[PDB]
Structure formats: C-alpha cells, structure tokens
Coordinates of C-alpha atoms in Angstrom, one line a residue:
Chain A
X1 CA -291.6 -202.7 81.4
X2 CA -290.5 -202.4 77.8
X3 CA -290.0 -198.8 76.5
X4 CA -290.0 -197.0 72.5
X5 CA -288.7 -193.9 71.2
X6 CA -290.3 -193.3 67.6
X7 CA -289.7 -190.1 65.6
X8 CA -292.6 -189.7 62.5
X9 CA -292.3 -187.9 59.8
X10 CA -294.7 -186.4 56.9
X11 CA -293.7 -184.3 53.8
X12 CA -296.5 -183.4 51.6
X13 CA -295.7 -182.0 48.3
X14 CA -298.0 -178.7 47.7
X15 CA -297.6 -177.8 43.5
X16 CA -297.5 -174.3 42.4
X17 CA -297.8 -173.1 46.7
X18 CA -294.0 -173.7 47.6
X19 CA -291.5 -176.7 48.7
X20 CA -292.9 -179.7 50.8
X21 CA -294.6 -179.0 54.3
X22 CA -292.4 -181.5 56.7
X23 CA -293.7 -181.8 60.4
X24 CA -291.6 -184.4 62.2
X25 CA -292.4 -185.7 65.9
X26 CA -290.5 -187.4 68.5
X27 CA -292.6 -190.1 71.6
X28 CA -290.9 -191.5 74.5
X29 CA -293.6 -194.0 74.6
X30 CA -296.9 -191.9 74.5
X31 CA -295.0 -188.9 75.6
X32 CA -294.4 -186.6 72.9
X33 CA -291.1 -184.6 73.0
X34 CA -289.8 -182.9 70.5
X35 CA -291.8 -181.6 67.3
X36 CA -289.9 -180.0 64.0
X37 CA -292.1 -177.7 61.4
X38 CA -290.7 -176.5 58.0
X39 CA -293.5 -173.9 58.0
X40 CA -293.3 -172.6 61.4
X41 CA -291.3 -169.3 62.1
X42 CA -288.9 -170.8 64.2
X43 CA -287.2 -172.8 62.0
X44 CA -285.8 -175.2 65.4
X45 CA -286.3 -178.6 66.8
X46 CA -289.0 -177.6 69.5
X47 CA -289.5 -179.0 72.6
X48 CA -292.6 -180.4 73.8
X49 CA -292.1 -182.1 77.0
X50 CA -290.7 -180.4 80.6
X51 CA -288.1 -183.1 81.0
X52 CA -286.3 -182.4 77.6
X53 CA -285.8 -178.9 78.9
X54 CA -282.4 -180.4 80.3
X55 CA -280.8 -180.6 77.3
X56 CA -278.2 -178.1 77.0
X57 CA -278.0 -175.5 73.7
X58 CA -275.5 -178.0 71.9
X59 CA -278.2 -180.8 71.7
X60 CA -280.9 -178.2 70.5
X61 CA -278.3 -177.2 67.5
X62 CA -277.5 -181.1 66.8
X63 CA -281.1 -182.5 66.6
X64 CA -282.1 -179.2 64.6
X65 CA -279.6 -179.4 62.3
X66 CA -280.1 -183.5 61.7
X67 CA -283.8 -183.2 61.1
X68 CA -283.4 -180.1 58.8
X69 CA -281.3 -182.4 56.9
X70 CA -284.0 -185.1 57.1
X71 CA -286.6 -182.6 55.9
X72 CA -284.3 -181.1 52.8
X73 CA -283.8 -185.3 51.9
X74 CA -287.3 -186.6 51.7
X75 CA -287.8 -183.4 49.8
X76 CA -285.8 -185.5 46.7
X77 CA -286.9 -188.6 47.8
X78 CA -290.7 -186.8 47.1
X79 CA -289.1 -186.2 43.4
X80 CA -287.8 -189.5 43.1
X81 CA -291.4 -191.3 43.8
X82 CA -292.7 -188.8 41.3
X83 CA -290.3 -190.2 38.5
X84 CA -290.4 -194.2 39.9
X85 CA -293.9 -194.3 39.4
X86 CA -294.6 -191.8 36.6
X87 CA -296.9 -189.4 38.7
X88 CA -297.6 -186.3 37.1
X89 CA -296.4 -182.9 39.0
X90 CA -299.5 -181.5 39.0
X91 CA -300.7 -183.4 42.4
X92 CA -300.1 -183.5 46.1
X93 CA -298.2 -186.9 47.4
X94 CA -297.2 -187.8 50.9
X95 CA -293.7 -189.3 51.8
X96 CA -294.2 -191.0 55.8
X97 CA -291.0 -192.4 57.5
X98 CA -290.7 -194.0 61.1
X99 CA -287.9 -194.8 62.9
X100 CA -286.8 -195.8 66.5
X101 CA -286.1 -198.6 68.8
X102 CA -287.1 -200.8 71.9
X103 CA -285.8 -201.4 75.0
X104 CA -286.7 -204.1 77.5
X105 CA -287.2 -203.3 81.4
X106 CA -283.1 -204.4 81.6
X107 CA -282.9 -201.4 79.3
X108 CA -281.3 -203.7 76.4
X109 CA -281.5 -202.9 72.7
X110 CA -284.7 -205.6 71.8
X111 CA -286.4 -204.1 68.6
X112 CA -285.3 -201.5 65.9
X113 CA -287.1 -199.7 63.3
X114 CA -286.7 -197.8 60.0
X115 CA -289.5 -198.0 57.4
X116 CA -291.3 -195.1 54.7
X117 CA -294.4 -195.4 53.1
X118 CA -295.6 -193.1 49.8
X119 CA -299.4 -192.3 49.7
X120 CA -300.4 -194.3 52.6
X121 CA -298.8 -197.1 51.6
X122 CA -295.4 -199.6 52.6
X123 CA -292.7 -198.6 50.3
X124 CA -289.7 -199.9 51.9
X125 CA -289.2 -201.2 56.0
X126 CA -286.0 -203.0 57.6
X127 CA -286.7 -205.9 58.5
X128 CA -286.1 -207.1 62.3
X129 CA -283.0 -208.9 61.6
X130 CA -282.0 -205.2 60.6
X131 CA -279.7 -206.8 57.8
X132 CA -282.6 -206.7 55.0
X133 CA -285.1 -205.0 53.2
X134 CA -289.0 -205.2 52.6
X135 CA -290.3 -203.5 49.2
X136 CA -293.7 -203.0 49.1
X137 CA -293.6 -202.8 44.6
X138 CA -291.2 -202.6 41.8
X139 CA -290.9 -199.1 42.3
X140 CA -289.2 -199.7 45.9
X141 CA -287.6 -202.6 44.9
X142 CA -285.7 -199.6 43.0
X143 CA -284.7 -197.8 46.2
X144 CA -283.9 -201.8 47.9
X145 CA -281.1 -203.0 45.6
X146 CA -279.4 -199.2 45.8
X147 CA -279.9 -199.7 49.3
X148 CA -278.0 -203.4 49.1
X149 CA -275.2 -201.9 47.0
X150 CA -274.9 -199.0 49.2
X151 CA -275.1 -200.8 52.8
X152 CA -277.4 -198.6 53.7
X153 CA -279.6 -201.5 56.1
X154 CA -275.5 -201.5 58.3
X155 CA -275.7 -197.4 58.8
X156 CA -278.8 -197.6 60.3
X157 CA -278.3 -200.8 62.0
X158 CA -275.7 -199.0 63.6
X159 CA -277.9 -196.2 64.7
X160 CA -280.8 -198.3 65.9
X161 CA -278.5 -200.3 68.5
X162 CA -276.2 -197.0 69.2
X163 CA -277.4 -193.9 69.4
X164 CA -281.2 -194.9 69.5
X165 CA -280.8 -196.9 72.8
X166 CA -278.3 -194.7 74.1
X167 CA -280.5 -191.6 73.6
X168 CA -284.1 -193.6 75.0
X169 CA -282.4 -194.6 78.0
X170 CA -280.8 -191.2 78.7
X171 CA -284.2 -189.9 78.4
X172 CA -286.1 -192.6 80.6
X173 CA -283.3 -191.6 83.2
X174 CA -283.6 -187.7 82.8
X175 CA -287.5 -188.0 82.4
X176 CA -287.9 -191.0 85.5
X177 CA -290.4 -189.0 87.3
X178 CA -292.9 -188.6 83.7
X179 CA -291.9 -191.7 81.8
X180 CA -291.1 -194.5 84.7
X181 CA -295.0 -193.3 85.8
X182 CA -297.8 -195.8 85.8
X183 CA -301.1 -194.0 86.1
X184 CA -303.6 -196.7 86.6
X185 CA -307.0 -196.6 84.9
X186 CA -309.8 -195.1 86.7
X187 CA -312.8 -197.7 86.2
X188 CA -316.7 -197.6 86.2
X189 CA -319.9 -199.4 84.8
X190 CA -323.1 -197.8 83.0
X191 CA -326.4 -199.2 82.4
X192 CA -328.9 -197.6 79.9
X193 CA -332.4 -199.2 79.0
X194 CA -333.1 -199.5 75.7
X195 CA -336.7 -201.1 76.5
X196 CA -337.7 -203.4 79.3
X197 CA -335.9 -206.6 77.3
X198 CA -332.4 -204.9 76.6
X199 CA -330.0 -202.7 78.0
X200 CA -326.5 -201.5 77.1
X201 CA -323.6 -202.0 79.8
X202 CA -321.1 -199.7 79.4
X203 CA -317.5 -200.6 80.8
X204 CA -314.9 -197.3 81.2
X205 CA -311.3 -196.7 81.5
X206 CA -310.2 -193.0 82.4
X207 CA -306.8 -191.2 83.5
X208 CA -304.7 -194.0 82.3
X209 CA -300.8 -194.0 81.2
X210 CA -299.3 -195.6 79.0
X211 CA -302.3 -195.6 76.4
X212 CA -301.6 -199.4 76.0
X213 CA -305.0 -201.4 77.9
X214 CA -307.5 -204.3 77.0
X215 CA -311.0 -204.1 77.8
X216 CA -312.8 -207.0 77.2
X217 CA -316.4 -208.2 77.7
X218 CA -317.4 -212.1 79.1
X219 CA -320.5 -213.6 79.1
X220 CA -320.2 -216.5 81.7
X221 CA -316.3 -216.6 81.3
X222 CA -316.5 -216.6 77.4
X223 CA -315.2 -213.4 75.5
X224 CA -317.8 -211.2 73.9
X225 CA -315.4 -209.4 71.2
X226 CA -317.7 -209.9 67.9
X227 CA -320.8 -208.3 70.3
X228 CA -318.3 -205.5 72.3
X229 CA -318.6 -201.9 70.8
X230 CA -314.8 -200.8 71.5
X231 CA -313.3 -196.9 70.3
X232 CA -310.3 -196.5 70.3
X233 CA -308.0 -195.3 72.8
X234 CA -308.1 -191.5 73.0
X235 CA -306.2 -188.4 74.3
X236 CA -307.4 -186.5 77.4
X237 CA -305.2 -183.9 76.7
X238 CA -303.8 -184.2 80.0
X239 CA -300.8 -186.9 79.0
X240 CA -303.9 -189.5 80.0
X241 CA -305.8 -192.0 77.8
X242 CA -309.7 -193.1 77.9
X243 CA -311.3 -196.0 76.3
X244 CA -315.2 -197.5 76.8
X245 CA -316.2 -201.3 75.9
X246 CA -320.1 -201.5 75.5
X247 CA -322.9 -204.9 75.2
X248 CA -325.9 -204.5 74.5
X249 CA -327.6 -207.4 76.9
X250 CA -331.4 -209.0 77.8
X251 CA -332.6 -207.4 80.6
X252 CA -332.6 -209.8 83.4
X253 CA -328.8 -211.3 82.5
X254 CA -326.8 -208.2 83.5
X255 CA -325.4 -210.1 86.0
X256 CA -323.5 -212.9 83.0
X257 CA -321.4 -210.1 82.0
X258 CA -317.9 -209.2 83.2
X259 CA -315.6 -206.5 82.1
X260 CA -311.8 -207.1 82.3
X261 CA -309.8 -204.3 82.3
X262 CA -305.6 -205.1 82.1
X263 CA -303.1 -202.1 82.7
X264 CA -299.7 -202.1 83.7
X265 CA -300.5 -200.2 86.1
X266 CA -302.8 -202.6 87.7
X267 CA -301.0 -205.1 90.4
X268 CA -304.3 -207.5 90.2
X269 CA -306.6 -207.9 86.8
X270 CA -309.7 -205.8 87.4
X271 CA -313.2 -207.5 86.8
X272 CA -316.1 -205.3 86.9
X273 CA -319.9 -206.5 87.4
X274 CA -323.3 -204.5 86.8
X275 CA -323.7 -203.7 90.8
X276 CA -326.7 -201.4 91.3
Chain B
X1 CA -303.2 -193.9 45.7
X2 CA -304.5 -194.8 49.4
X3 CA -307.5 -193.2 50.6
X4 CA -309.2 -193.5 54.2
X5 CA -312.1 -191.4 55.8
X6 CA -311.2 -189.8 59.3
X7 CA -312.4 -191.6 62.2
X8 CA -314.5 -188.9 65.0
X9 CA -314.9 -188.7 68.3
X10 CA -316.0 -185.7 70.5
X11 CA -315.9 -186.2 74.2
X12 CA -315.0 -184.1 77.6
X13 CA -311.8 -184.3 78.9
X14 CA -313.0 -184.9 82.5
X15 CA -316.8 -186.3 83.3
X16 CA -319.2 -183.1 82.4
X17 CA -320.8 -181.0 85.1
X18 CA -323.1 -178.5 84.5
X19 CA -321.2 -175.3 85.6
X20 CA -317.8 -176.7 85.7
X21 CA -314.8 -175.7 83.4
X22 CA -313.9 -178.8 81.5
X23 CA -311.9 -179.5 77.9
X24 CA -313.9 -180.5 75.1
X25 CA -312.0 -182.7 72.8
X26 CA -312.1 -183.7 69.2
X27 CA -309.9 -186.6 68.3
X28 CA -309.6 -187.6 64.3
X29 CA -307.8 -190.4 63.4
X30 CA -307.3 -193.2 61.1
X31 CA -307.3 -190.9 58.0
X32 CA -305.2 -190.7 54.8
X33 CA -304.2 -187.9 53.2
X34 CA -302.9 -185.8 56.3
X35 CA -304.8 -182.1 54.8
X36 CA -308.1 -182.0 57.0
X37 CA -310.5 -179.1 58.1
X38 CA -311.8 -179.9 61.7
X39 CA -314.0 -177.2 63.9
X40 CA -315.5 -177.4 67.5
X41 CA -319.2 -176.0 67.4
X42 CA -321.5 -174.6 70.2
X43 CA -325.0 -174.5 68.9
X44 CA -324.1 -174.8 64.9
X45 CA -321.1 -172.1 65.5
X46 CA -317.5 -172.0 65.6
X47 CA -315.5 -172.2 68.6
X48 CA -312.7 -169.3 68.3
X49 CA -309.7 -170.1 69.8
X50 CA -309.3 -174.3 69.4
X51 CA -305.6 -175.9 69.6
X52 CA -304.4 -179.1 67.7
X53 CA -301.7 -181.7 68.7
X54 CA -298.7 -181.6 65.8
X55 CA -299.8 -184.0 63.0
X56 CA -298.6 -187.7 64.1
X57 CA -299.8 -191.1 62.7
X58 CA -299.9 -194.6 63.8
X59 CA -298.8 -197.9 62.9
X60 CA -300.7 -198.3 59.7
X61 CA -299.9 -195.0 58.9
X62 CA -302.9 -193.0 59.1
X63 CA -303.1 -189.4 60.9
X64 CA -304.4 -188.5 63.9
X65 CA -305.1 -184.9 65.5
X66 CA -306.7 -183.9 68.5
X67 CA -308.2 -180.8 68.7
X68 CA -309.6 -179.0 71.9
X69 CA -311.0 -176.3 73.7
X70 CA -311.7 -175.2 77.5
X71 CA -315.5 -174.9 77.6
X72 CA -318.5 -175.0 80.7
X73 CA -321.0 -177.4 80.0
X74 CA -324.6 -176.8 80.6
X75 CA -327.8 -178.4 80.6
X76 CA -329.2 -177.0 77.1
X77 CA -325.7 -175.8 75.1
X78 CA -324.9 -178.7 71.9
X79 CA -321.5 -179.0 71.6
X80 CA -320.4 -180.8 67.9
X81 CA -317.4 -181.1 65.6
X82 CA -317.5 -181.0 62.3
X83 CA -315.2 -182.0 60.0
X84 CA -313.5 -182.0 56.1
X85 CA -311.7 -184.4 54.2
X86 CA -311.0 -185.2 50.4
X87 CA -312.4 -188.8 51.2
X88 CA -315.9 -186.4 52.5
X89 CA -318.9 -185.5 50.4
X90 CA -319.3 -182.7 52.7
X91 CA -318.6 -181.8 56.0
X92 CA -319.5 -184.5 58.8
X93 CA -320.9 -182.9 62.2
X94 CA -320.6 -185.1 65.2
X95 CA -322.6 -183.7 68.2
X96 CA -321.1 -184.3 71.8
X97 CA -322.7 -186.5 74.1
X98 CA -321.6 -186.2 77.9
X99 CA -322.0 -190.4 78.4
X100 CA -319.7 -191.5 75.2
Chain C
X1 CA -282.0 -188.3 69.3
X2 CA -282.2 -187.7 65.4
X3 CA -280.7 -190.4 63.0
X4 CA -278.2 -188.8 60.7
X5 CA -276.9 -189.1 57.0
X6 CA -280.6 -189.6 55.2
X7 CA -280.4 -191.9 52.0
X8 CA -282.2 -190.7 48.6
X9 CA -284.5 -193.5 47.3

C-alpha cells in the first residue's frame, strides 16, 4: 500500500519565561521515529523507534543540526507574525508547520507537503502541483509573494521529490519488519439493554496497524452514519490502534444491523451480526 | 485567535481483568492551544508516575497527547482523568469505564 | 530525513 513520512512542528512563544518551546516529531506512517525538544537536556535529534537505531553517528549529527536550524527559524518567523498582524508581545502564539511526502506501493514519489499554520489556523500550504502557494489572509499573502520572488515553492519542491522519498523508502527498507506489518483488527459485538424496547450494539476494533479503518453500521444494507456513535481512533500504547461504532436499536431488530469493519489488513471485508 | 476544547477518552489498553496488570490510557486530542494540564486519578487522587507521548497534532492541526499508566484493575477501584485547558472553566474529570 | 535551508515569513 501507499506510505507517508510527516515531520510536525510547534513553537510556542512564552513572554517574560525565555525563547520559544519547539518540539518537532518525525511518523513513518503511524510509527513515530524521531522526536527533537528545545527544552530537553539533550539538546539532539532523539530516536524513538528500534529500527532507526541503524543510523550511524553522521545521520544523528545531520538531522540534529537541520532541525536545530528549523527550531532557531520559526523562532523569527514567531516575530514576524507578531509584526504582520500587529499582536502585542505580551501574549503566547503558536507557529505549526508540516512537511513530508507519499509514496505509492511502487514506492514512487505520489504526494508532497509543506504547509504552517499561526494560532490554529492555515497561514500558508504548497499546493499539490508543488509550483504555488495557498495564503490563508493578507498577512500570509505577505510571506507568498516573498516566497514567489524568492522561489522558495522550487527548494522545497526539490526536497519533497528528493530527499523526502529517498529517505521514506530507505526507512520502509531498513524498518520492513515494523513498517511493511499489517496487524489486522481484532473484532467483537456488545449488547447492553437499556429497557426491554432498546438496546445498544456495540461494534469493536482492537490491536490494529496502521490506525487507518472504517467502521460502519447497516440497517438492512443501508448505512447508519447520522445514528452510529463513532470515537476516534485511539492509541493503545502498544504501536496498536482501537476504535468502537455504537446504535442504539428496538429490541426485537438486532438482527437488521450489520457492522462492517475494512482494514488493510483484512484479505475479505468483515461483517459482524448480533449472535448470542 | 483559534480556540478548541480537548477531546477525552480514558480506556484500558488491553480488555480489564480484575487482578491483571493492564495500561490505563488517557488520550486528549483535537485541542488548540497545545499548553494542557492532564492527571490520571484512582479514587479522586493522583496517579504518580504517568508518561505522555511528545506533543503531535493532526491534519486540522489540533494537538493530541496520550497519557498512561500501568495499573491492576479491580472490582470497586474508580479510575478518572481529569483535565485543564484555557478553553476549560475548570478542570473536566472523565471517569474510566472498562466497556468504552 | 529533515528538510534544510528554512525560509523566514
């Protein structure tokens, strides 16, 4: 199947308590593999997965050394918001980036990404043609036509269909045994009266990998999605995912009700039925 | 300025028996600004020794954390998280419940 | 693997 790499990143600004906390974080998928932390006493890229391990001393320098840089940038580019939108000093503000790419089962570049947002909100994304520039206001419209001037959307372009691929497939290679895993969900059905006219039906998935699933509820063939209490997907803290679907349902008509469960690491479609 | 109130849900790592080592797990997400105060409870106090995943976020761009703890259910011991955020009026408590 | 050469806004 298709595969990701995405590195997040998140500097708060902290007034009158020091410089900006950054905390970056590097997924192979849902496999989290490097972390970075301007607070902690290490002062190093960290890693957070056995498989990256492998990496030799040279690699650990290089990727610290980049995201330092990184950390030391968004620093200004925290100042900068400040001054494009007027923002007293006096408060806490957040600067988010993402970046990464995809790669299809053929292990071809498919999908690249590089994209900020200031106080929850888009401030500036490359678009998929990687050529061009989304700005969410006037303020990042600021930050686009420097951007244009300074070909900025080509340097990254050139990273998201170099480097990026090259590095995600080195690491689908070196981590085969982790990543290349499919750890099919592990299904069951609850029932719980809630009076002798209605009862809730209660559809699980547990143990899965990747964290990507549907669970869906029919009634007679027809989805149930408006009716279907769904969480989201959660962390076992094992490198698994859980999810639950529930209906609430007329006692008597249990039997109408179907959960579908879809996983890639299910060869057939799973449909489950209330069987007592 | 983007606000949104964490997300909660406290749940076992594996299926709870009574007796049996297990991981109790709160998961935040869906929250904006990233500063939040989260604490596993047993019986209304605080859990000593509870690890956090490093701060990520997800497509939208809101945060998510999951915090845990190893811990042996019982029958009669309440297990809760409780937790702060600007976007609070005061701390939210979420009590564990072994089938959700 | 890290991207390199970060932009100021």
């Amino acid at each position: 199947g298709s595969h990701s790499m995405r590195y997040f990143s998140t500097s708060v600004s902290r007034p009158g308590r020091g410089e900006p906390r950054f905390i970056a974080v590097g997924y192979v998928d849902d496999t989290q593999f490097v972390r970075f932390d301007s607070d902690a006493a290490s002062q190093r890229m960290e890693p957070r997965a056995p498989w990256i391990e492998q990496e030799g001393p040279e690699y650990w320098d290089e990727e610290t050394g980049k995201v330092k840089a990184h950390s030391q940038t968004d620093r200004e580019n925290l100042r900068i918001a400040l001054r494009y939108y007027n923002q007293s000093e006096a408060g806490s503000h957040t600067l988010q980036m993402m970046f990464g790419c995809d790669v299809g089962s053929d292990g071809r570049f498919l999908r690249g990404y590089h994209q900020y947002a200031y106080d929850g909100k888009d401030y500036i994304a490359l678009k998929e043609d990687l050529r061009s520039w989304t700005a969410a206001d006037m303020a990042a419209q600021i930050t686009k036509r420097k951007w244009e001037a300074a070909h900025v959307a080509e340097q990254q372009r050139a990273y998201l269909e170099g480097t990026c691929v090259d590095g995600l497939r080195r690491y689908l290679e070196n981590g085969k045994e982790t990543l290349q895993r499919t750890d099919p969900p592990k299904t069951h059905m609850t029932h719980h009266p809630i009076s002798d006219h209605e009862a809730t039906l209660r559809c699980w998935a547990l143990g899965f990998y990747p964290a990507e699933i549907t669970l869906t509820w029919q009634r007679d063939g027809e989805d149930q999605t408006q009716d279907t209490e769904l969480v989201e997907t959660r962390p076992a803290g094992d490198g698994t995912f859980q999810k639950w679907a529930a209906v609430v349902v007329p006692s008597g008509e249990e039997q109408r009700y179907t959960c579908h469960v879809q996983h890639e690491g299910l060869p057939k479609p799973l449909t489950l039925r209330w069987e007592p | 300025m983007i606000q949104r109130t964490p997300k909660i849900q406290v749940y076992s790592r594996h299926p709870a028996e009574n007796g049996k080592s297990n991981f109790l797990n709160c998961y935040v997400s869906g929250f904006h600004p990233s500063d939040i105060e989260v604490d596993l409870l047993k019986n209304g106090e605080r859990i000593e020794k509870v690890e956090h995943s490093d701060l990520s976020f997800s497509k939208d761009w809101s945060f998510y954390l999951l915090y845990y703890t190893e811990f042996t259910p019982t029958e009669k011991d309440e297990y809760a998280c409780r937790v702060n955020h600007v976007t609070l009026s005061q701390p939210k408590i979420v009590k564990w419940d072994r089938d959700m | 693997n890290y991207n390199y050469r970060y932009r100021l806004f």
